[PDB]
Design brief:
The record marks 302 as: Important for interaction with PIK3C2B. It is found in: Cell membrane; Endoplasmic reticulum membrane; Golgi apparatus membrane; Nucleus membrane. Residues 16-273 form the Protein kinase domain. GO terms for molecular function: actin filament binding; ATP binding; ATPase binding; cadherin binding; chromatin binding; double-stranded DNA binding; enzyme binding; epidermal growth factor binding. This protein has 305 residues and is an alpha+beta fold. The protein folds into two domains: 1-93, Phosphorylase Kinase, domain 1 (2-Layer Sandwich); 94-295, Transferase(Phosphotransferase) domain 1 (Transferase(Phosphotransferase), domain 1, Orthogonal Bundle). The chain has eight helices and nine strands. The strands form three sheets. The protein has a five-stranded antiparallel beta sheet with strand order 1-2-3-5-4, with helices on one face. The chain has a two-stranded antiparallel ribbon with strand order 6-9. The chain is globular, with a radius of gyration of 20 Å. The two termini are 24 Å apart. The structure holds N-[4-(3-bromo-phenylamino)-quinazolin-6-yl]-acrylamide and chloride ion (CL) (2 copies). N-[4-(3-bromo-phenylamino)-quinazolin-6-yl]-acrylamide binds at residues 22-23, 30, 47, 49, 89, 91, 93-94, 97-98, 100-101, 142, 145, 155-156.
Length: 305
């Protein structure tokens, strides 16, 4: 392979305010905050991710390695790490949260134009990863984030690996059949997970195979069962999802095809998704709460040599 020359930026804890908890888990916490780069006069809204103590540092560090290596408008990148205590990951804040929560909150206001655009943007992020030979291995709507309603990015590179390499809970309900049976993971298994992510969006946040248990799933899948057609979905859309779920991994769409197909559909959204009162809907895009925030710069506009 080629040398990875990404810069890992180390950030002093003095540099930022950990303004509030955003989320918490058995898996550690995520905070929102501000990062003021030393002597730069800019304020950058950020998310800070953290937390045995020695063996969780290793998992988190791998995530930083992958995150620091990616650069694309539809992938989240690491701004840097902070080395105090347990290691902290710093990234651009995505103010509207994850896409899964967002579709749940806004089902009434979400039009076909947006649903399809997200499908295009996610396929672009995934295609980028494939170009860099990354197999993500945890694609799901929970792991897609909303910068604005018009702009989403892929995240959560904790399970990521280079294609070919082999290196708690595994996401059964999003995984390709070969993955569940044989722990095989390719860009095409990511395609399968893409199918499920799209289904999650088209159902406005439904849980796939609600009620069923993970042990059950490889079995359901072997019989030939699949996720059902969502109400808003034309057969055109649903059949794209279905192709993402073929047994023959080489028979599934490539991410570059997914970009093309969804992109065509996004020209004529009302022809592919049927949504009641679709035309009326609008989603809102100051926004930065603090009073002295006119030195605020989004991370996308903050570039380093
Ligand atoms: C579905 C819940 C959720 O993901 N909430 C959330 C909201 C905003 C946000 N902004 C920036 N980053 C993240 N998550 C994240 C994932 C991996 C690494 C890092 Br540093 C941050 C969120 C998450
Ligand atoms: Cl699961
Ligand atoms: Cl729900």
């Amino acid at each position: 392979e080629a040398p990875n020359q990404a810069l890992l930026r180390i950030l002093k804890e003095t540099e930022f305010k950990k303004i509030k908890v955003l989320g918490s888990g058995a898996f550690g916490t995520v905070y929102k905050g501000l990062w003021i780069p030393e002597g730069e006069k800019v304020k950058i809204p950020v998310a800070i991710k953290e937390l045995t103590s020695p063996k969780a540092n290793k998992e988190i560090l791998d995530e930083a390695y992958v995150m620091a290596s990616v650069d694309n408008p539809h992938v989240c990148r690491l701004l840097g790490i902070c080395l105090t205590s347990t290691v902290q990951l710093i990234t651009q804040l995505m103010p509207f949260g994850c896409l899964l929560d967002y579709v749940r909150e806004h089902k009434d206001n979400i039009g076909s134009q947006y649903l399809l655009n997200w499908c295009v943007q996610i396929a672009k992020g995934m295609n980028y990863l494939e170009d860099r030979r990354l197999v993500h291995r945890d694609l799901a709507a929970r792991n897609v984030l909303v910068k604005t309603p018009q702009h989403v990015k892929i995240t959560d590179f904790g399970r990521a690996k280079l294609l070919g390499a082999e290196e708690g809970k595994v996401p059964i309900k999003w995984m390709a059949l070969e993955s569940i049976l044989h722990r095989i993971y390719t860009h095409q298994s990511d395609v399968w997970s893409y199918g499920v992510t799209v289904w999650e969006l088209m159902t406005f946040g439904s849980k796939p195979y609600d009620g069923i248990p993970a042990s059950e799933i490889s079995s359901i899948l072997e019989k030939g069962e699949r996720l059902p057609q969502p109400p808003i979905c034309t057969i055109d859309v649903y059949m794209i999802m279905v192709k993402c779920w073929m047994i023959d991994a080489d028979s599934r769409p490539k991410f570059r095809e997914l970009i093309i197909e969804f992109s065509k559909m996004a020209r004529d959204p009302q022809r592919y998704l049927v949504i009641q009162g679709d035309e009326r809907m609008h989603l809102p895009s100051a926004l930065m709460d603090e009073e002295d925030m006119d030195d605020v710069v989004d991370a996308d506009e903050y570039l380093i040599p």
